[PDB]
Amino acid sequence: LYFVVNVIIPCLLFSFLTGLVFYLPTDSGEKMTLSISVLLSLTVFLLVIVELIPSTSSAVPLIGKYMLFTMIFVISSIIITVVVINTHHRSPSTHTMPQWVRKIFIDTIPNVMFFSTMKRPDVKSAIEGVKYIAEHMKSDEESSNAAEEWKYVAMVIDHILLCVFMLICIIGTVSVFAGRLIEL
Amino acid sequence: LYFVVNVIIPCLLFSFLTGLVFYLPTDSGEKMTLSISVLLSLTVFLLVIVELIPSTSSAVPLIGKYMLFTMIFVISSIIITVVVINTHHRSPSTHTMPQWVRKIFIDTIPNVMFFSTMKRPDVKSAIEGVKYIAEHMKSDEESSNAAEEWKYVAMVIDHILLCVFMLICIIGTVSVFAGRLIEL
Amino acid sequence: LFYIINIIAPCVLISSLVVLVYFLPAQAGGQKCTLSISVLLAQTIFLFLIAQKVPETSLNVPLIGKYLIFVMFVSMLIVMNCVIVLNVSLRTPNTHSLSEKIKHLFLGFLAPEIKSCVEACNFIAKSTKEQNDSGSENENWVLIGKVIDKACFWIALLLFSIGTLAIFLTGHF
Amino acid sequence: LFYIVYTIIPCILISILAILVFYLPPDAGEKMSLSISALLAVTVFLLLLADKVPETSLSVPIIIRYLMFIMILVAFSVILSVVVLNLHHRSPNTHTMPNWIRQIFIETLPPFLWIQRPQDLKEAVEAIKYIAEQLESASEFDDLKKDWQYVAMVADRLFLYVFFVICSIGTFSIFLDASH
Amino acid sequence: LFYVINFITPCVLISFLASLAFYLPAESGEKMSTAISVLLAQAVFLLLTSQRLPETALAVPLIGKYLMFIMSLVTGVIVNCGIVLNFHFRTPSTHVLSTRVKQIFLEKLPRILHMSHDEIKSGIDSTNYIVKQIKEKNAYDEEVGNWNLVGQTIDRLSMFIITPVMVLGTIFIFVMGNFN
């Protein structure tokens, strides 16, 4: 009871939060805020754990095992969040969307996400000037469409990753501890 | 040797980082981020000193004086950074540039900065509307020019302060440390 | 085994995070500096952590302390390079000058109412043209920044891997 | 007295912070700074308490119980801030606003909560018409986005009030119970 | 001397840095950042001071009384910074600019503080639409500029009102304390 309350519960909370980061839309530019603050909280808690658990070396304790899994869990989260941000801000000038990315993440995947709510004289000069303004607006709209397609792809990746990372947190959590729980 | 690697090297890193903020442009909203985080790092380091050096009260140690110097150094850099960001966003409507400010910081000092590379029916309704659009562009460009003049003053201030700050860093460091070091 | 499980592996994991900064965008909102300076703060925490394990004699620096200093310094270099990329990508023809050298290296190898209406239309088109020019220059500088991202990514990956493997396989032998 | 100062005063000021995060406008882009920095404070207070409570493992002292309760309250305030920010930054390109959200949060709650808010001429005409159309399209897109963000706004106000009540009452009760 | 050098001067400096928040413009979105890091350092000083004294409860030491008072002052500055950004960003669609506020902050204080062929028809319709949208945006923008000007004038007045207050409070306490 003492060790549960004083050690394990805080670690559960931080695992949950880090998992939550994937529901934050990329349009709110605060993905790096949240993920790096979670990482610093995790580092500090590493500090805590070494402060608390015994310093034996015979064998890896259960808390040791669990701490290692938690560290990898946080790290993965952070790296995929960076990945999404980088995908969203993908320059069309230097990159071209592969056909299979578009087919998979824009067309099919959003459709199988049922529980989600995501979308599935001088008059001639004047006239020429007006025409130029209109055609420039056309070209700007085209550029903006390509950018919006990239943002749409990011959003639908966030949805899918939110599902996926809840699943991974569950699976890993059950596996790490069920053996020892049943042993007691 | 033990004291050098254990104390002075980390302090050298932090000192070097301090002045780096002044080469970072104001466009990136992260001048206060970076400088305040450097300050916090130094304040945290004060723990390291306190936990490492002897806890006598007879007199102030050499590294005590050096760390006080470094405190004041950091705090000056951060104050000037804030100043320049405040000046960059000043609005013409409220703040009119004093004549002496313009004479000094916009005309005089930029010339004497050699090292820097910084520069120194319906037809009537349609016609009236066209005229309206053109005058609105006029006005937009004018307000942007005023604001741009403020931004330009801020940028020149940053350059100048970079050069001054690097010199002061150097001077202060040498004087503080060499004198004791040679005795060892 | 005790040192590997309690000090070496946790330290290595945290320190390997500095190689992530090369996949953040190099423009405002990318937060290269936020991330990198936070990683440096964790590295400081590691230096404090190690002060508690090494022996108290002061005639030499231990090997592990040497290694910590080395990795901290490499992380600092990569934070510097993120900051430099941000500076390069936000450049403008007015503040800086995009030398053609850089361009080759990166963009290469790697009634009176009628007359007043027409005048106002012409002026509108001209203002739009001016604004678009300025912007075009800006996007050129963004594309240079993206090239530099790729190139620096590869440099940093190679450097970190090599450095770490060698230094920590010397101790194992 | 001793305990009042040395433990309760610092705690109080951190609880006021975490409450204040819900008065910050979502447009400021500073909710996560405030909230997560409050969470750092709470974990710091747990470190602070470690070296004052007795080292026995039969039970948990009341002061640690109150710290944990306060920690969980502060966490939930963070959580709800992150929800509000998620709501604010929704758009038609990502979400479809449901009828129940609109009915509950825009129509009903605000009054209860007291908020209440020639070829060449044809060519040139086509160009002008296009310009106008673009303008208008942007406006419509922004209007839907602003409906989302208005829903965020009203939920943020409601959380403000709720958390203020909750923190004040729980803190008071705990403290009097401890000082009797 | 030991306490003046090790205890009083670092804490005093750090607290003084809180006044800079008032000279940092609301447009530079970094008021919260700055204030919350200041608060964290003050937390740390409180932790430092708790370790230096015995656990008696006869009375709070003089330096403890001064730390309490000065922390509390600083925390009031942080809260007011947050409030100021809240005021700066209010708009007609959410707040009412009362006459008292107009009088105070737009007339009196600025002065006191010395502050500084149907296709062509449709194209004509589209250009008139462009102009209508531009006019609407201008009225919207000039009221938003009113709000901007309010914030600026609050900045100036806050500096001039707060720096002297901090200084006088500090001088009086410390001359009292120098006579001990």
Numbering used by the authors:
A (entry chain D), B (entry chain A): 212 to 331, 370 to 433
C (entry chain E): 220 to 329, 410 to 472
D (entry chain C): 218 to 334, 398 to 460
E (entry chain B): 226 to 341, 416 to 479
Quote from the publication:
pmcThe postsynaptic membrane at the synaptic junctions of electrocytes and striated muscle cells comprises a cholesterol-rich phospholipid bilayer, most densely populated by a single membrane-spanning protein, the nicotinic acetylcholine receptor. This well-characterized heteropentameric ion channel forms regular closely packed arrays, an organization thought to maximize the speed and magnitude of depolarization of the membrane in response to acetylcholine released into the synaptic cleft. The membrane-spanning portion of the acetylcholine receptor has four TM helices (M1–M4) and one submembrane helix, MX, comprising each of its five subunits (αγ, β, δ, αδ, γ). The nicotinic acetylcholine receptor at the nerve-muscle synapse resides in an asymmetric cholesterol-rich membrane, the inner leaflet of which consists largely of ordered lipid assemblies due to a high cholesterol concentration.
To characterize further the junctional receptor in relation to the nanodisc form, a model of the junctional form was obtained by fitting the nanodisc-solved structure to the density map, using real-space refinement. The junctional form of this protein, analyzed by cryo-EM of postsynaptic-membrane-derived tubular vesicles, has a tapered pore (Top) framed by a splayed arrangement of TM helices (Middle) and a symmetrical rim of MX helices lying flat against the inner (cytoplasmic) bilayer surface (Bottom). In addition, time-resolved experiments on the tubular vesicles have shown that loop C of the αγ subunit closes around the binding site, and that the pore widens, on brief exposure to acetylcholine, indicating that the (unreacted) junctional receptor is in a closed (resting) and activatable state. In the junctional protein (gold), the upper portion of the pore is tapered (Top) due to the fact that the M2 helices separate from one another in the outer leaflet of the bilayer. Biochemical studies on isolated Torpedo postsynaptic membranes have identified the conserved leucine at the 9′ position as a major gate-forming residue, in agreement with the narrowing of the junctional pore at this point. The densities corresponding to the junctional form show all five helices to be about equally resolved and equal in length. Only the junctional MX helices align closely with a cylindrical arc of curvature equivalent to that of the bilayer surface and so have a near-planar arrangement. The fact that these helices both lie parallel to and penetrate the headgroup region of the bilayer (Top) implies that they engage directly with the cholesterol-ordered lipids: a possibility that does not exist in the nanodisc environment. Likewise, but to lesser extents, the other subunit–subunit interfaces are widened at this level in the structure.
